[PDB]
Amino acid sequence: RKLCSLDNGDCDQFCHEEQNSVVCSCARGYTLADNGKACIPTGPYPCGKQTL
Amino acid sequence: IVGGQECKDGECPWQALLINEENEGFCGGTILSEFYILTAAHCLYQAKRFKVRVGDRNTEQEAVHEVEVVIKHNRFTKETYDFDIAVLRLKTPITFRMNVAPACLPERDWAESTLMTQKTGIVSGFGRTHEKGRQSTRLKMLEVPYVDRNSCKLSSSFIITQNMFCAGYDTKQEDACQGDSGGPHVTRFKDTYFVTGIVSWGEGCARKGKYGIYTKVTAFLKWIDRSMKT
Numbered sequence: 001r002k003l004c005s006l007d008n009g010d011c012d013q014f015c016h017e018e019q020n021s022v023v024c025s026c027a028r029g030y031t032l033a034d035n036g037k038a039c040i041p042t043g044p045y046p047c048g049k050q051t052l
Numbered sequence: 053i054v055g056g057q058e059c060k061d062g063e064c065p066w067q068a069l070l071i072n073e074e075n076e077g078f079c080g081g082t083i084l085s086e087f088y089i090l091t092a093a094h095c096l097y098q099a100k101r102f103k104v105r106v107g108d109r110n111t112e113q114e115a116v117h118e119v120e121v122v123i124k125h126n127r128f129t130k131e132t133y134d135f136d137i138a139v140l141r142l143k144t145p146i147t148f149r150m151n152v153a154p155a156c157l158p159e160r161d162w163a164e165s166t167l168m169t170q171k172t173g174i175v176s177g178f179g180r181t182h183e184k185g186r187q188s189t190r191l192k193m194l195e196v197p198y199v200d201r202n203s204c205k206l207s208s209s210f211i212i213t214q215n216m217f218c219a220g221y222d223t224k225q226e227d228a229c230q231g232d233s234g235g236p237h238v239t240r241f242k243d244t245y246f247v248t249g250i251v252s253w254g255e256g257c258a259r260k261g262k263y264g265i266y267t268k269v270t271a272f273l274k275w276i277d278r279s280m281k282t
Protein backbone atom coordinates (compact mmCIF):
# COMPACT_ATOMS: atom_id res chain seq x y z
CA ARG A 1 0.00 0.00 0.00
CA LYS A 2 1.38 3.37 -1.11
CA LEU A 3 0.13 6.94 -1.61
CA CYS A 4 -3.71 7.10 -1.59
CA SER A 5 -3.86 3.37 -0.79
CA LEU A 6 -1.98 4.01 2.46
CA ASP A 7 -4.50 5.39 4.96
CA ASN A 8 -6.10 7.64 2.34
CA GLY A 9 -2.80 9.50 1.80
CA ASP A 10 -3.38 11.00 5.26
CA CYS A 11 -6.13 13.17 3.62
CA ASP A 12 -9.28 14.09 5.54
CA GLN A 13 -11.48 13.59 2.49
CA PHE A 14 -10.64 13.13 -1.20
CA CYS A 15 -7.25 11.66 -2.18
CA HIS A 16 -5.86 11.62 -5.75
CA GLU A 17 -2.49 10.69 -7.18
CA GLU A 18 -0.92 13.29 -9.49
CA GLN A 19 2.59 12.66 -10.84
CA ASN A 20 3.16 9.88 -8.27
CA SER A 21 2.34 11.97 -5.17
CA VAL A 22 -0.73 12.49 -2.97
CA VAL A 23 -3.02 15.45 -3.63
CA CYS A 24 -5.83 15.93 -1.07
CA SER A 25 -9.05 17.85 -1.67
CA CYS A 26 -12.39 18.53 0.03
CA ALA A 27 -16.14 18.62 -0.55
CA ARG A 28 -17.89 21.87 -1.33
CA GLY A 29 -18.18 24.02 1.80
CA TYR A 30 -14.73 23.00 3.11
CA THR A 31 -11.36 24.61 2.49
CA LEU A 32 -8.16 22.57 2.32
CA ALA A 33 -5.98 23.42 5.33
CA ASP A 34 -2.47 24.87 5.19
CA ASN A 35 -1.04 21.34 5.65
CA GLY A 36 -2.73 20.27 2.39
CA LYS A 37 -4.50 17.37 4.13
CA ALA A 38 -7.18 18.57 6.59
CA CYS A 39 -10.56 19.95 5.51
CA ILE A 40 -11.89 22.95 7.41
CA PRO A 41 -15.61 23.90 7.31
CA THR A 42 -16.45 27.36 6.00
CA GLY A 43 -19.78 27.58 7.93
CA PRO A 44 -21.82 26.17 10.91
CA TYR A 45 -23.55 23.35 8.99
CA PRO A 46 -20.91 21.85 6.67
CA CYS A 47 -22.07 18.89 4.65
CA GLY A 48 -21.78 15.45 6.15
CA LYS A 49 -21.56 16.49 9.78
CA GLN A 50 -24.01 15.32 12.37
CA THR A 51 -25.46 18.30 14.25
CA LEU A 52 -24.41 17.31 17.79
CA ILE B 53 -36.68 0.53 8.64
CA VAL B 54 -36.85 -2.97 10.13
CA GLY B 55 -34.57 -3.36 13.14
CA GLY B 56 -31.93 -0.65 13.53
CA GLN B 57 -32.21 2.24 15.96
CA GLU B 58 -34.04 5.53 16.36
CA CYS B 59 -32.10 8.53 14.95
CA LYS B 60 -31.11 10.49 18.06
CA ASP B 61 -30.82 14.30 18.15
CA GLY B 62 -28.69 15.50 15.24
CA GLU B 63 -27.70 12.02 13.99
CA CYS B 64 -29.50 11.99 10.60
CA PRO B 65 -29.79 15.67 9.62
CA TRP B 66 -29.82 15.02 5.86
CA GLN B 67 -33.04 13.06 5.96
CA ALA B 68 -35.92 14.52 3.95
CA LEU B 69 -39.52 13.27 3.83
CA LEU B 70 -41.80 13.54 0.81
CA ILE B 71 -45.35 14.21 1.99
CA ASN B 72 -48.59 13.99 0.00
CA GLU B 73 -51.60 16.39 0.00
CA GLU B 74 -52.88 14.72 3.18
CA ASN B 75 -49.49 15.59 4.76
CA GLU B 76 -48.51 11.91 5.02
CA GLY B 77 -44.98 10.62 4.31
CA PHE B 78 -44.62 8.22 1.40
CA CYS B 79 -40.93 8.39 0.47
CA GLY B 80 -37.60 9.67 1.70
CA GLY B 81 -35.01 11.98 0.18
CA THR B 82 -31.53 13.30 1.02
CA ILE B 83 -30.66 16.99 1.50
CA LEU B 84 -27.83 17.90 -0.93
CA SER B 85 -27.81 21.68 -0.50
CA GLU B 86 -30.12 24.50 0.51
CA PHE B 87 -32.12 24.13 -2.73
CA TYR B 88 -31.72 20.48 -3.67
CA ILE B 89 -33.10 17.11 -2.56
CA LEU B 90 -32.04 13.68 -3.92
CA THR B 91 -34.71 10.98 -4.22
CA ALA B 92 -35.79 7.93 -6.28
CA ALA B 93 -37.46 8.44 -9.66
CA HIS B 94 -40.03 5.77 -8.73
CA CYS B 95 -41.28 7.90 -5.83
CA LEU B 96 -42.57 10.50 -8.31
CA TYR B 97 -45.36 8.09 -9.33
CA GLN B 98 -46.52 7.60 -5.72
CA ALA B 99 -48.20 11.03 -5.48
CA LYS B 100 -49.44 13.64 -7.97
CA ARG B 101 -48.53 16.71 -5.89
CA PHE B 102 -46.14 16.57 -2.92
CA LYS B 103 -43.99 18.70 -0.63
CA VAL B 104 -40.72 18.09 1.24
CA ARG B 105 -40.42 18.14 5.04
CA VAL B 106 -37.00 18.48 6.76
CA GLY B 107 -35.95 18.49 10.40
CA ASP B 108 -38.60 16.16 11.76
CA ARG B 109 -37.58 13.12 13.79
CA ASN B 110 -41.01 12.58 15.29
CA THR B 111 -44.01 12.98 12.93
CA GLU B 112 -46.31 13.51 15.95
CA GLN B 113 -44.68 16.73 17.24
CA GLU B 114 -43.85 20.17 15.80
CA ALA B 115 -39.94 23.12 7.86
CA VAL B 116 -42.11 22.27 4.84
CA HIS B 117 -40.88 23.17 1.35
CA GLU B 118 -42.69 23.26 -1.92
CA VAL B 119 -41.02 21.83 -5.03
CA GLU B 120 -40.15 24.20 -7.90
CA VAL B 121 -38.57 21.77 -10.39
CA VAL B 122 -38.69 17.96 -10.53
CA ILE B 123 -35.73 16.46 -12.45
CA LYS B 124 -36.34 12.78 -13.16
CA HIS B 125 -33.77 10.62 -14.93
CA ASN B 126 -35.19 10.25 -18.45
CA ARG B 127 -34.03 6.62 -18.62
CA PHE B 128 -35.92 5.40 -15.56
CA THR B 129 -38.50 2.67 -16.21
CA LYS B 130 -40.60 0.50 -13.89
CA GLU B 131 -39.82 -2.50 -16.11
CA THR B 132 -36.25 -2.70 -14.76
CA TYR B 133 -36.07 -0.04 -12.01
CA ASP B 134 -32.80 1.02 -13.62
CA PHE B 135 -31.74 4.71 -13.37
CA ASP B 136 -33.90 5.08 -10.21
CA ILE B 137 -32.89 8.71 -9.45
CA ALA B 138 -34.45 12.17 -9.31
CA VAL B 139 -33.40 15.60 -8.07
CA LEU B 140 -35.84 18.18 -6.63
CA ARG B 141 -35.19 21.93 -6.65
CA LEU B 142 -37.11 23.70 -3.89
CA LYS B 143 -38.97 27.01 -4.18
CA THR B 144 -37.41 28.32 -0.97
CA PRO B 145 -34.00 27.44 0.54
CA ILE B 146 -33.68 25.11 3.51
CA THR B 147 -32.43 26.71 6.74
CA PHE B 148 -29.74 24.50 8.24
CA ARG B 149 -30.01 23.96 11.97
CA MET B 150 -29.96 21.11 14.47
CA ASN B 151 -31.39 18.09 12.57
CA VAL B 152 -31.21 19.87 9.19
CA ALA B 153 -27.93 19.71 7.23
CA PRO B 154 -26.78 18.40 3.85
CA ALA B 155 -24.95 15.10 3.23
CA CYS B 156 -21.74 15.43 1.23
CA LEU B 157 -21.47 14.44 -2.42
CA PRO B 158 -18.16 12.61 -2.95
CA GLU B 159 -15.92 12.66 -6.01
CA ARG B 160 -16.56 9.59 -8.12
CA ASP B 161 -13.22 7.73 -8.23
CA TRP B 162 -12.56 8.27 -4.56
CA ALA B 163 -16.05 7.16 -3.62
CA GLU B 164 -15.65 3.92 -5.61
CA SER B 165 -12.23 3.19 -4.15
CA THR B 166 -12.72 4.42 -0.57
CA LEU B 167 -16.42 4.59 0.34
CA MET B 168 -17.93 1.64 -1.47
CA THR B 169 -15.12 -0.57 -0.19
CA GLN B 170 -15.96 0.21 3.46
CA LYS B 171 -17.58 -2.54 5.54
CA THR B 172 -20.88 -0.71 6.01
CA GLY B 173 -23.17 2.16 5.15
CA ILE B 174 -26.18 3.68 6.94
CA VAL B 175 -29.75 3.72 5.65
CA SER B 176 -32.48 5.85 7.27
CA GLY B 177 -36.16 6.69 7.00
CA PHE B 178 -39.70 6.76 8.37
CA GLY B 179 -40.74 3.56 6.59
CA ARG B 180 -42.48 0.51 8.03
CA THR B 181 -40.81 -1.31 10.91
CA HIS B 182 -42.16 -4.66 9.65
CA GLU B 183 -43.16 -5.85 6.19
CA LYS B 184 -46.76 -5.67 7.42
CA GLY B 185 -47.18 -2.52 9.52
CA ARG B 186 -47.78 1.21 9.59
CA GLN B 187 -45.17 3.91 8.75
CA SER B 188 -42.86 4.72 11.69
CA THR B 189 -43.63 7.95 13.53
CA ARG B 190 -39.93 8.10 14.47
CA LEU B 191 -37.00 8.48 12.13
CA LYS B 192 -34.85 5.32 12.21
CA MET B 193 -31.36 4.40 10.97
CA LEU B 194 -29.67 1.09 10.29
CA GLU B 195 -26.06 0.06 9.68
CA VAL B 196 -26.01 -2.10 6.53
CA PRO B 197 -23.02 -4.02 5.30
CA TYR B 198 -22.07 -3.69 1.65
CA VAL B 199 -22.82 -6.93 -0.19
CA ASP B 200 -20.44 -8.56 -2.65
CA ARG B 201 -21.78 -8.03 -6.14
CA ASN B 202 -21.68 -11.73 -7.09
CA SER B 203 -23.61 -12.68 -3.92
CA CYS B 204 -26.04 -9.87 -4.77
CA LYS B 205 -26.72 -11.12 -8.33
CA LEU B 206 -27.04 -14.74 -7.20
CA SER B 207 -29.69 -13.90 -4.57
CA SER B 208 -31.84 -11.79 -6.88
CA SER B 209 -34.92 -12.69 -8.90
CA PHE B 210 -34.36 -9.53 -10.96
CA ILE B 211 -31.39 -8.13 -12.86
CA ILE B 212 -28.99 -6.05 -10.78
CA THR B 213 -27.64 -3.38 -13.18
CA GLN B 214 -24.40 -1.43 -12.77
CA ASN B 215 -26.51 1.48 -11.53
CA MET B 216 -27.46 -0.60 -8.47
CA PHE B 217 -25.75 -2.10 -5.45
CA CYS B 218 -26.83 -4.46 -2.62
CA ALA B 219 -26.61 -3.84 1.09
CA GLY B 220 -27.93 -5.49 4.21
CA TYR B 221 -28.02 -8.94 5.72
CA ASP B 222 -28.54 -12.46 4.41
CA THR B 223 -30.68 -13.74 7.29
CA LYS B 224 -30.47 -11.11 10.08
CA GLN B 225 -33.87 -9.38 10.39
CA GLU B 226 -32.83 -5.81 9.52
CA ASP B 227 -33.52 -3.90 6.28
CA ALA B 228 -35.12 -0.83 4.71
CA CYS B 229 -38.84 -1.25 4.07
CA GLN B 230 -41.94 0.35 2.52
CA GLY B 231 -41.86 4.16 2.86
CA ASP B 232 -38.05 4.28 3.10
CA SER B 233 -37.69 4.47 -0.72
CA GLY B 234 -35.92 7.54 -2.07
CA GLY B 235 -34.12 7.99 1.25
CA PRO B 236 -30.43 8.19 2.10
CA HIS B 237 -27.76 5.58 2.07
CA VAL B 238 -24.66 7.32 3.46
CA THR B 239 -21.14 6.11 4.19
CA ARG B 240 -19.02 7.46 7.03
CA PHE B 241 -15.37 8.30 6.45
CA LYS B 242 -13.49 10.02 9.31
CA ASP B 243 -16.67 11.43 10.89
CA THR B 244 -17.96 12.87 7.59
CA TYR B 245 -21.01 11.31 5.92
CA PHE B 246 -21.17 11.01 2.14
CA VAL B 247 -24.24 10.08 0.11
CA THR B 248 -23.57 6.72 -1.52
CA GLY B 249 -27.00 5.33 -2.33
CA ILE B 250 -30.71 5.93 -2.74
CA VAL B 251 -33.15 3.41 -1.24
CA SER B 252 -34.59 1.78 -4.38
CA TRP B 253 -36.23 -1.66 -4.07
CA GLY B 254 -36.23 -5.06 -2.38
CA GLU B 255 -38.05 -8.40 -2.55
CA GLY B 256 -40.06 -7.69 0.59
CA CYS B 257 -38.29 -6.52 3.76
CA ALA B 258 -35.53 -8.35 5.65
CA ARG B 259 -36.38 -11.65 3.90
CA LYS B 260 -33.95 -14.55 4.17
CA GLY B 261 -31.48 -14.73 1.27
CA LYS B 262 -32.52 -11.30 -0.05
CA TYR B 263 -30.83 -7.90 0.25
CA GLY B 264 -31.87 -4.28 -0.14
CA ILE B 265 -31.18 -2.72 -3.54
CA TYR B 266 -29.90 0.84 -3.80
CA THR B 267 -29.26 3.26 -6.64
CA LYS B 268 -25.49 3.67 -6.95
CA VAL B 269 -24.95 7.42 -6.53
CA THR B 270 -21.37 7.21 -7.95
CA ALA B 271 -22.91 6.28 -11.33
CA PHE B 272 -24.79 9.63 -11.34
CA LEU B 273 -22.46 12.22 -9.83
CA LYS B 274 -22.06 14.08 -13.11
CA TRP B 275 -25.82 13.85 -13.70
CA ILE B 276 -26.52 15.21 -10.21
CA ASP B 277 -23.99 18.05 -10.69
CA ARG B 278 -25.67 19.03 -13.97
CA SER B 279 -29.17 18.85 -12.43
CA MET B 280 -28.06 21.24 -9.64
CA LYS B 281 -27.21 23.88 -12.26
CA THR B 282 -30.77 24.54 -13.60
Ligand SMILES: CN(C)C(=O)c1ccc(N2CC[C@H](NS(=O)(=O)/C=C/c3ccc(Cl)s3)C2=O)c(F)c1
Nearest residue numbers: 131132133210228229230252253254255256264265
Ligand atom coordinates in the same frame (compact mmCIF):
# COMPACT_ATOMS: atom_id res chain seq x y z
C1 LIG C 1 -37.50 -4.77 -11.98
N1 LIG C 1 -37.69 -4.70 -10.52
C2 LIG C 1 -36.50 -4.81 -9.66
C3 LIG C 1 -38.96 -4.52 -10.13
O1 LIG C 1 -39.84 -4.30 -10.94
C4 LIG C 1 -39.34 -4.60 -8.69
C5 LIG C 1 -40.08 -3.53 -8.20
C6 LIG C 1 -40.49 -3.53 -6.88
C7 LIG C 1 -40.18 -4.58 -6.03
N2 LIG C 1 -40.62 -4.58 -4.67
C8 LIG C 1 -41.48 -5.62 -4.13
C9 LIG C 1 -42.04 -5.00 -2.85
C10 LIG C 1 -41.03 -3.92 -2.47
N3 LIG C 1 -41.64 -2.71 -1.96
S1 LIG C 1 -41.16 -2.11 -0.54
O2 LIG C 1 -41.39 -3.17 0.39
O3 LIG C 1 -41.89 -0.87 -0.46
C11 LIG C 1 -39.45 -1.79 -0.64
C12 LIG C 1 -38.66 -2.40 0.24
C13 LIG C 1 -37.20 -2.28 0.33
C14 LIG C 1 -36.39 -3.15 1.05
C15 LIG C 1 -35.03 -2.84 0.98
C16 LIG C 1 -34.81 -1.74 0.22
CL1 LIG C 1 -33.28 -1.01 -0.13
S2 LIG C 1 -36.25 -1.05 -0.43
C17 LIG C 1 -40.29 -3.62 -3.77
O4 LIG C 1 -39.53 -2.68 -3.95
C18 LIG C 1 -39.44 -5.63 -6.54
F1 LIG C 1 -39.14 -6.66 -5.72
C19 LIG C 1 -39.01 -5.67 -7.86
